């Protein structure tokens, strides 16, 4: 595999450092590496494709090495080179794609394609070099067993979940108490509502709580926590839990009281914040617990008092909420986020070539389904497949 | 460079052990006998064939 | 042009790899490249500025080489070097800026300034080197007429558009049906409203649709799709279509029914998603079509039933909506996005030097105006100008 | 200090370019640099830790070097190398962490730890090399007293602030006029409300204004400006200014009239935009001023007219708002943003090792507190500490 | 059959007793046995699968002996060995599985697969060893 990597950085640092006008010596160390390749290759033949709509093209090698005309390259030098590169580019593309579609439950962490299986062969190792591309960097460190780690902006850790839980309800749905939320991507919005405005509640306070369990631990997370859940601050007509009817939600928002956010790891509180809105750091956690309360206002102007009567009908529904967004974080496992194109690359190549659903990944590489049941097999396959996508993007975007 | 052009007999040991150059040779025969050299030494010197 | 590039990576990899200490051997390959430059330059004379409030500055060259002698580097070596670099820095800055202001209809792609036009000359080509900077990388591939491509976080593809369309209206604006939306940057929010809650509609369902045509194709897009349009979930007083009066919008939100998102390319459906909220991939499209419905709730609790009478006045206005955000995508054309400073750099240099409006770009480099009428000339000029901004940011931020 | 840097890029470019197979002549220039180090070190003793829950591990040096022969690398070569690297890694980690906790009122910009103070020594300078990591790049340019600069996506310039100002109020809070806002991170949302809908106001227009003073100047900012403040578009029960009671806010939203955004620098208007929504550029500013008005609709349909009576009670509260988001910008001072992990790294190391509160940073490295009173000492310490975090992340994530 | 057995204890006592570090003479008696194998094999082509969803895989043999030398086994020695073992492992697996599914009435105790039938051949017996399992 690592083999593969090189092939590219070779070409990139090539299609880049090899231009009409640079002094030879700026590529002396490079040129070499290159040739070395051609050699090892020539002779051996390859097969790519042979699945879904993916074409089966046959590649063969027969190339002459590279000259060295002294003192900065002459145009002619380039063109005779570029012609050779273009065959490798169009090659790798086909190589990546071919191994970017196969999946395997048993050993879905190793090479699948006839193309790559042949590369892991020993007679090729002679190429590997400059492993600085963040992904390969972590691919190695994992083969030896050590502390990996990636960087993500607005990580996609929460499978889509939009629902509610009625802690107090009745057929008419005219005096409910519970929570409703939206967990998606890197964001959580949760609202706690009490139609009675805690009129009969101890200390006139209703407690709420929202717990979210991550499928993977996030470390070094920079998080924005804000009071209120705008998403649940407007009038709604919602389906009942049993789907038999619809209820009316007419919120009026109050500040969440006694806000406490806990970032836990294996049941232990690692970070805890009491009513701290703005930017907070959660250094290592697999669970987020948001606790907040609705406290009936002890003093009310007439306009406010009018919204909260001592007896039903309760027409204005007291609501308190929180919004939490993970701006950035590090994860030991690959994940989709708001900046990297890996998931999109893998998903796109599979869609374009009409690749049949396999035994590992959910239909369409669906993110929610994937992260919901993020098994070891799916993760190993995802990492292999993401690393290949990153190798491909060095040359083909 | 080539090595056959420097071949030499490792006087000691089964397996027609041949070694690199003169100095290489000397040393072996030499240590072989300094009785205070771990049993592993003679062994290695021994069986190690070209 | 490519020439220009080098000049910088030369300086960067210079002001970076050259310091009090290190071994010669780590820069040997570098030092050379450098000198090579000085030579080609010396003797030549330049001129930058002259437009608007931009100062005119002349530059000459007559500099000593570099001691290729020493083993290690002594402080003294650096200072005698840094002094020479600083003249080039202050130079390039003035060079960039001077070519970052001029526009041109006919050939808006090639160089403009007396400064650069002179560089494209053959006698300077003896300086190109290490073109791994994403932008130049793509500048070349476009000259050779091949498949380019850039990477963007929250791209800026949608010109600002905030409006509505009343499909059913009357003077009193007391029983409207239509859609309202906000397309801006990488986001779309659209709501469909029916004051009558589909009381007289076939199957008690009102169909809605929102189509957005991109000015450029986006590929490998990672997109967040969520139900509801929070922006259109609150009470509003809006101006009538003819501007003669104002209407009242008092929404109550229901879940969008039969949601279907289609990402089309030249009229063909490339990706289609039915009611799938969360993260979805759109691999290649120039159009987005969002179709959704409002279905009158077949079963209603009293509180809900009360909002939707059989006869006017209709006081609670049934509303369904969708929110779509393009987190990342690739485009073959340069665009502004939420992370890159290119647009801001170009716009800022022009504003600071009071550069007069030209024949190509809209006043103030206005993004909405630019993307709305993204002509080939504007794109070629934008790419030239963005590539220069990126060359400049390697040294001056 | 710079010393430190090298130590890493040494290891990275090492644990990266040294793999079973690669051709020697790709590392010739590298190998050297490496050895050079070992030498300078051997014969030196260090000590890290001693504070809070940070272990006190001791280190010594005494190592052999590396062969220079071999066309290609044999597995055996690596392993004998990796074994030596791992001691340096586990070293640096402890070195970073030890200097990443101490703060000094005086010279919070200079080295602290017994470990590093010893490195700034002259006899170690012989190790410097390849300073291209954005942070160190800027560390130097500053030490020389020159123009710095960084890059941030969704910078964190606004300390959390969520409040209101009642310009007209009375005990019953039944006819208020004022503004409410949320400044946090890179975003500002502000709403102006007038319960009377400007019924008795000159020209039936109520003027609003919101001013935000940045603690540091931002340059080259790409900004999204949109009409409406969704956060303040829903019903709320709010505490009175004196905390003695609660008032009711029942907004109805109208388009903000005569919107004018000014980006000022030292009291001077640098950029001004009149009613321009979408993407705008603010090239250099330390203050943002948003002015907008509520204009009573001159023509109203019955439904609208009904919301705005000539006499109290005023039950629907006319509200106009704006939303402004700084997507990206450059700052001469380090700041937290939505992508970089620096703040989180520093905060996390301190939390994990139970580092006691010091004399410079607020408890918990609280961002709001830090940016609110961003003194020169806090900035120098923050930069030192952020630069170290970035050096560490090259090897340990 | 018994043949088969060896193939493994060979590999186990191999992937086990052969590691970065060990002194020479702890593999002398072993090393030998190993090589002996490679020889007998090289040249003969094999075939596994062909039934149900069992992939028809082709196997070929052409591997160099060993550097029966170095004293305290250098890392490099291992890796060049492990690479050869892994082909045999992935082999045997396929060999076992292929004969672990065929049934025969008349004479059901004997070997079935084209893979194994070929092993019971005399020219291979030169391998059997350590039948303590
Ligand atoms: Zn963002």
Interface test with E, best of D79, D80, D83 (most E CBs within 10 A): D79
Output the 3-class SS for chain D. Answer: CHHHHHHHHHHHHHHHHCCCCCEHHHCHHHHHHHHHHHHHHCCCEEECCCCCCCCCCEEECCCCCCCCCCCECCHHHHHHHHHHHHHHHHHHHHHHHHHCCCCCCCCCCCCCCHHHHCCCCHHHHHHCCCCCCHHHHHHHHHHCCCCCCCCEECECCEEEEEEEEEEECCCCCCCCEEEEEEEEECEEEEEEEECCCCCCCHHHEEEEEEEEEEEEEEEEEEEEEEECCHHHCCCEEEECCCCCCEEEECEEECCCEEEEEEEEECCEEEEEEECCCEEEEEEEEEEEEEEEEEECCCCCCHHHHCCCCCCCCCCCEEEEEEEEEEEEEEECCCCCECCCCHHHHHHHHHHHCCCCCCCCCCHHHCHHHHHHCCCHHHHHHHHHHHHHHHHHCCCCC
Phi, psi of C279 (to 5 degrees): -100, 125
Shared domain for A137 and A167, answered yes or no, is no
Minimal CA–CA distance to C308: which of C198, C234, C203, C230?
C198
Contact D176, D154 (CB under 8 A): no
CA distances from A287 to A214, A268, E46, E110 (A): 6, 9, 53, 59
Contact D389, D382 (CB under 8 A): no
CB interface of D with C, residues 233-272, below 8 Å: 233-234, 251-255, 271
Shared domain for A337 and A229, answered yes or no, is no
- Determine the residue of chain E that is closest to B43 in CA distance: E25
Contact A342, A334 (CB under 8 A): yes
Number of domains within chain C: 2
Shared domain for C172 and C314, answered yes or no, is yes
C301 CA to centre of ligand 1 in angstroms: 41
Contact A52, A355 (CB under 8 A): yes
Contact A59, A48 (CB under 8 A): yes
Kindly state whether E25 is in contact with chain B, defined as any CB-CB distance less than 8 angstroms.
Answer: yes
- Determine the residue of chain D that is closest to E80 in CA distance: D75
User: CB under 8 Å to C116, separation ≥6 — which residues?
Assistant: C1, C4, C95, C98, C99
Helix (H) or strand (E) holding C326: strand C317-331
Contact D57, D49 (CB under 8 A): yes
CA distances from C263 to A353, C180, C260, C274, D125 (A): 17, 20, 10, 12, 58
Output the 3-class SS for C248-313. Answer: EECEEECCCEEEEEEEEECCEEEEEEECCCEEEEEEEEEEEEEEEEEECCCCCCHHHHCCCCCCCC
Kindly state whether B41 is in contact with chain E, defined as any CB-CB distance less than 8 angstroms.
Answer: no
Tell if the CB–CB gap between C28 and D32 is shorter than 8 Å.
no
Q: How far is Cα D345 from Cα E109, in angstroms, rounded to an integer? A: 66
Rg of chain B over Cα atoms, rounded to whole angstroms, equals 11
Tell if the CB–CB gap between C278 and A351 is shorter than 8 Å.
no
User: CB under 8 Å to E94, separation ≥6 — which residues?
Assistant: E48, E49, E57, E59, E115
C38 CA to centre of ligand 1 in angstroms: 43
Contact A127, A375 (CB under 8 A): no
Helix (H, G, I), strand (E, B) or coil at C169: coil
Shared domain for C260 and C186, answered yes or no, is yes
CA distances from A181 to A191, A210, A225 (A): 6, 8, 15
Residue the block writes with tokens 């419905």 = C293
D154 CA to centre of ligand 1 in angstroms: 6
CB interface of A with D, residues 110-129, below 8 Å: 125-129
User: CB under 8 Å to C373, separation ≥6 — which residues?
Assistant: none
Q: How far is Cα D308 from Cα D300, in angstroms, rounded to an integer? A: 9
Q: Is D354 left (phi over 0), alpha (psi -120 to 50) or beta?
A: left
Residue the block writes with tokens 């007219």 = D305
Q: What angle do CA C88, C91, C94 make, to 5 degrees?
A: 155
Strands E46-48 and C177-185: unpaired
A213 CA to centre of ligand 1 in angstroms: 23
Shared domain for A67 and A169, answered yes or no, is no
> Helix B22-32 and helix B39-47: axis angle, to 10°?
140
Residue the block writes with tokens 């370019």 = D17
Contact D336, D343 (CB under 8 A): yes
> Helix D342-352 and helix D376-392: axis angle, to 10°?
90
Q: Which residues of C43-67 are buried (b: 16+ CB within 10 A; e: fewer)?
A: eeebebbebeebeebebebeeeebe
Q: How far is Cα C36 from Cα C27, in angstroms, rounded to an integer? A: 14
> Helix E2-17 and helix E28-41: axis angle, to 10°?
130
Size of interface A-D (CB pairs under 8 A): 173
Shared domain for D169 and D292, answered yes or no, is yes
How far out from the chain centre does Cα C17 lie?
33
Shared domain for D227 and D93, answered yes or no, is no
Please indicate whether chains A and D are in contact, defined as at least 3 beta carbon pairs under 8 Å.
yes
- Residues in chain A with CB shorter than 8 Å from the CB of C303 are 172-174, 247-248
Kindly state whether E70 is in contact with chain D, defined as any CB-CB distance less than 8 angstroms.
Answer: no
CA distances from E26 to A71, A197, B32, C70, E64 (A): 58, 81, 21, 53, 21
Task: Centre a 10 Å sphere on the Cβ of residue D110 and count the other Cβ atoms it contains.
Answer: 13
- Could you say which of D19, D23, D248 has the minimum Cβ distance to residue A304? D248
Helix (H, G, I), strand (E, B) or coil at E18: coil
Tell if the CB–CB gap between A19 and C154 is shorter than 8 Å.
no
Interface test with D, best of C29, C191, C246, C343 (most D CBs within 10 A): C246
Could you tell me the maximum CA-CA distance found in chain E, to the nearest angstrom? 54
Q: How far is Cα D65 from Cα E42, in angstroms, rounded to an integer? A: 42
Minimal CA–CA distance to A7: which of A97, A109, A93, A112?
A93
Helix (H, G, I), strand (E, B) or coil at A46: strand
CB interface of D with C, residues 12-51, below 8 Å: 28-30, 32-33, 36
Strands C251-253 and C317-331: parallel
Shared domain for D216 and D333, answered yes or no, is no
Shared domain for A342 and A320, answered yes or no, is no
We report the CATH number of the domain holding residue A135 as: 1.10.1350.10
User: CB under 8 Å to C297, separation ≥6 — which residues?
Assistant: A237, A245, A246, C254, C304, C308
CA distance D315 to chain A (A): 9
Helix (H) or strand (E) holding C346: helix C342-352
- Residues in chain E with CB shorter than 8 Å from the CB of D76 are 74-77
- Could you say which of E23, E28, E68 has the minimum Cβ distance to residue B40? E23
D111 CA to centre of ligand 1 in angstroms: 34
Kindly state whether A310 is in contact with chain D, defined as any CB-CB distance less than 8 angstroms.
Answer: no
List the subunits that have 3+ CB pairs under 8 angstroms with A.
C, D
C35: number of CA atoms within 13 Å, CB side? 14
Contact C394, C121 (CB under 8 A): no
Q: How far is Cα D281 from Cα D290, in angstroms, rounded to an integer? A: 15
Minimal CA–CA distance to C138: which of C281, C285, C5?
C5
Kindly state whether D75 is in contact with chain E, defined as any CB-CB distance less than 8 angstroms.
Answer: yes
Q: What method did the depositors use to determine the structure?
A: cryo-EM
Q: Choose one of A328, A355, A374: the last residue of a domain.
A: A328
> What residue spans of A164-257 are helical by DSSP H?
none
Minimal CA–CA distance to C179: which of C114, C229, C218?
C229
Q: How far is Cα D309 from Cα D172, in angstroms, rounded to an integer? A: 18
We report the CATH number of the domain holding residue C197 as: 2.60.120.170
- Could you say which of C144, C151, C280 has the minimum Cβ distance to residue A341? C151
Shared domain for D226 and D138, answered yes or no, is no
Contact A269, A258 (CB under 8 A): no
Q: How far is Cα D285 from Cα D265, in angstroms, rounded to an integer? A: 4
A292 CA to centre of ligand 1 in angstroms: 27
Q: How far is Cα D78 from Cα A92, in angstroms, rounded to an integer? A: 28
C395 CA to centre of ligand 1 in angstroms: 26
Kindly state whether A79 is in contact with chain C, defined as any CB-CB distance less than 8 angstroms.
Answer: no
CA distance D221 to chain C (A): 6
Provide the 8-state DSSP code for A54: B
CA distance C333 to chain A (A): 12
Shared domain for D148 and D185, answered yes or no, is no
Helix (H) or strand (E) holding A272: strand A268-274
C187 CA to centre of ligand 1 in angstroms: 12
Question: Which residue numbers of C belong to the known binding site for Ca(2+)?
Answer: 266, 286
Q: How far is Cα C210 from Cα C225, in angstroms, rounded to an integer? A: 14
Q: How far is Cα A328 from Cα A322, in angstroms, rounded to an integer? A: 19
- Residues in chain C with CB shorter than 8 Å from the CB of A22 are 33, 127-129
Task: Dig out the tokens for A195 from the structure.
Answer: 């139609």
Tell if the CB–CB gap between A302 and D172 is shorter than 8 Å.
yes
Q: How far is Cα A98 from Cα C269, in angstroms, rounded to an integer? A: 25
How far out from the chain centre does Cα A310 lie?
49
Q: Choose one of A298, A328, A358: the last residue of a domain.
A: A328
CA distances from C305 to A75, C309, C316, C317, D26 (A): 79, 7, 11, 13, 77
Q: Choose one of D301, D328, D355: the last residue of a domain.
A: D328
Kindly state whether D72 is in contact with chain E, defined as any CB-CB distance less than 8 angstroms.
Answer: no
Task: Dig out the tokens for C357 from the structure.
Answer: 């409006």
Q: How far is Cα A4 from Cα E1, in angstroms, rounded to an integer? A: 41
Residue the block writes with tokens 């992939």 = E55
Residue the block writes with tokens 């591939």 = C141
Q: What angle do CA C267, C270, C271 make, to 5 degrees?
A: 125
Q: How far is Cα C253 from Cα C228, in angstroms, rounded to an integer? A: 8
Q: How far is Cα A292 from Cα A190, in angstroms, rounded to an integer? A: 10
Q: Which residues of D179-203 are buried (b: 16+ CB within 10 A; e: fewer)?
A: bbbbbbbbbbbbbbbbbbbbbebee
Helix (H) or strand (E) holding C35: helix C28-41
Tell if the CB–CB gap between B43 and E24 is shorter than 8 Å.
yes
Kindly state whether E68 is in contact with chain B, defined as any CB-CB distance less than 8 angstroms.
Answer: yes
Interface test with C, best of A11, A17, A18, A23 (most C CBs within 10 A): A23
Please indicate whether chains C and E are in contact, defined as at least 3 beta carbon pairs under 8 Å.
no
Q: Which long-range contacts (CB under 8 A, 24 or more apart) does C120-126 make?
A: C120/C1, C120/C3, C123/C40, C124/C3, C124/C40, C125/A20, C125/A21, C125/C3, C126/A21, C126/A23, C126/A72, C126/C36, C126/C40
Tell if the CB–CB gap between D20 and E79 is shorter than 8 Å.
yes
Q: How far is Cα C140 from Cα C109, in angstroms, rounded to an integer? A: 13
Residue the block writes with tokens 């949608």 = C158
Contact D187, A360 (CB under 8 A): no
D153 CA to centre of ligand 1 in angstroms: 7
Size of interface B-E (CB pairs under 8 A): 15
User: CB under 8 Å to A316, separation ≥6 — which residues?
Assistant: A250, A251, A252, A307, A308, D235
Q: How far is Cα D8 from Cα A116, in angstroms, rounded to an integer? A: 33
Residue the block writes with tokens 């030890």 = D98
C338 CA to centre of ligand 1 in angstroms: 7
- Could you say which of B40, B43, B48 has the minimum Cβ distance to residue E69? B48
CA distance C15 to chain D (A): 8
Q: How far is Cα E120 from Cα E133, in angstroms, rounded to an integer? A: 19
- Determine the residue of chain E that is closest to B48 in CA distance: E69
Tell if the CB–CB gap between E79 and D80 is shorter than 8 Å.
no
Helix (H) or strand (E) holding A47: strand A45-47
Task: Dig out the tokens for D135 from the structure.
Answer: 């942070």
Task: Dig out the tokens for A231 from the structure.
Answer: 């998403």
The number of residues making up chain E comes to 133
Kindly state whether D304 is in contact with chain C, defined as any CB-CB distance less than 8 angstroms.
Answer: yes
Q: How far is Cα A368 from Cα C224, in angstroms, rounded to an integer? A: 11
The number of residues making up chain C comes to 397
Q: How far is Cα A328 from Cα A60, in angstroms, rounded to an integer? A: 45
Shared domain for C163 and C41, answered yes or no, is no
CB interface of D with A, residues 182-221, below 8 Å: 182, 184-185
Task: Centre a 10 Å sphere on the Cβ of residue A200 and count the other Cβ atoms it contains.
Answer: 10
Domain that holds residue A217: 159-328
Q: How far is Cα A114 from Cα C252, in angstroms, rounded to an integer? A: 58
Rg of chain A over Cα atoms, rounded to whole angstroms, equals 29
- Residues in chain E with CB shorter than 8 Å from the CB of B48 are 69, 71
């Amino acid at each position: 595999m690592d083999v593969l990597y090189s092939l590219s950085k070779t070409l990139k640092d090539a299609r880049d450092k090899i231009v009409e006008g640079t002094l030879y010596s700026n590529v002396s160390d490079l040129i070499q590496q290159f040739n070395q390749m051609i050699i090892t290759m020539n002779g051996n033949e390859f097969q790519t494709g042979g699945i879904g709509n993916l074409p089966i093209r046959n590649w063969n090698f027969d190339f002459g090495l590279l000259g060295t005309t002294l003192l900065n390259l002459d145009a002619n030098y380039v063109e005779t080179a570029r012609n050779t590169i273009d065959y490798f580019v169009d090659f790798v593309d086909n190589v990546c794609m071919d191994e970017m579609v196969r999946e395997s439950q048993r050993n879905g962490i190793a090479p699948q394609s006839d193309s790559l299986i042949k590369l892991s062969g020993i007679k090729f190792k002679r190429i590997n070099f400059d492993n600085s591309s963040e992904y390969i960097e972590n691919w190695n460190l994992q083969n030896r067993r050590q502390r990996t780690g990636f960087t993500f902006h607005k990580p996609n850790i929460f499978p889509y979940s939009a629902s509610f839980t009625l802690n107090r309800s009745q057929p008419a749905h005219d005096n409910l108490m519970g929570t409703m939320w939206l967990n998606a991507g890197s964001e959580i919005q949760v609202a706690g509502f009490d139609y009675s405005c805690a009129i009969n509640a101890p200390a006139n306070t209703q407690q709420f709580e929202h717990i979210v369990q991550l499928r993977r631990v996030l470390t070094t997370a920079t998080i924005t926590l804000l009071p209120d859940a705008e998403r649940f601050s407007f009038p709604r007509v919602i389906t009942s839990a049993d789907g038999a009817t619809t209820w009316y939600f007419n919120p009026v928002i109050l500040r969440p009281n006694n806000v406490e956010i806990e970032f836990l790891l294996n049941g232990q509180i690692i970070n805890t914040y009491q009513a701290r809105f703005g930017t907070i750091i959660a250094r290592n956690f697999d669970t987020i617990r948001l606790s907040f309360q609705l406290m009936r206002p002890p003093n009310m102007t007439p306009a406010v008092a009018a919204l909260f009567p001592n007896a039903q009908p309760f027409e204005h529904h007291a609501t308190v909420g929180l919004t939490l967004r993970i701006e950035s974080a590090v994860c030991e496992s690959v994940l989709a986020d708001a900046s990297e194109t890996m998931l999109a690359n893998v998903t796109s190549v599979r869609q374009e070539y009409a690749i049949p659903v396999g035994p590992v990944f959910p239909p369409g590489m669906n993110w929610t389904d994937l992260i919901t049941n993020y098994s070891p097999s799916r993760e190993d396959n995802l990492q292999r497949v993401f690393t290949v996508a990153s190798i491909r993007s060095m040359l083909v975007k | 460079l080539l090595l056959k052009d420097m071949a030499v007999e490792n006087k000691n040991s089964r397996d027609a052990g041949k070694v690199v150059d003169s100095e290489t040779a000397s040393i072996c025969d030499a240590i072989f006998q300094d009785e205070e050299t771990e049993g592993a030494v003679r062994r290695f010197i021994a069986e190690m064939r070209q």
